[PDB]
Amino acid sequence: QIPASEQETLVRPKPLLLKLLKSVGAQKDTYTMKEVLFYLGQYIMTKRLYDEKQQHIVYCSNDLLGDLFGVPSFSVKEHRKIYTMIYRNLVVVN
């Protein structure tokens, strides 16, 4: 479904996404999607927003991640949906 090339996409985060990213990783102007997914994953894990042994759901109603995505929770299995939510919070650079 998801191609390997997606993780090579170069992106400029919008301000709220950039704020989230800077709380877990070095600040730079441009990131790859691989970086954005790693850093968001680490944000989720460190903050214990992910209930793995509970239908694999991230709960974000009480966190800026919920403002970023516009949902109170989401399944981590729904990669296509997660990409869409992330895409809306960045500009692709080419």
Ligand SMILES: O=C(O)c1ccc([C@H]2C[C@H]3[C@@H](N2)[C@H](c2cccc(Cl)c2F)[C@]2(C(=O)Nc4cc(Cl)ccc42)N3CC2CC2)cc1
């Ligand atoms: O048993 C399954 O069937 C199963 C179990 C787990 C996953 C999940 C865990 C991982 C990864 N796959 C997921 C992911 C990686 C690449 C691209 C995408 Cl679109 C993606 F969603 C990721 C991640 O690595 N970064 C990131 C960032 C956000 Cl915003 C949301 C979720 C994640 N998950 C981190 C985990 C803390 C929640 C998928 C299926």
Ligand SMILES: [Zn+2]
């Ligand atoms: Zn399971």
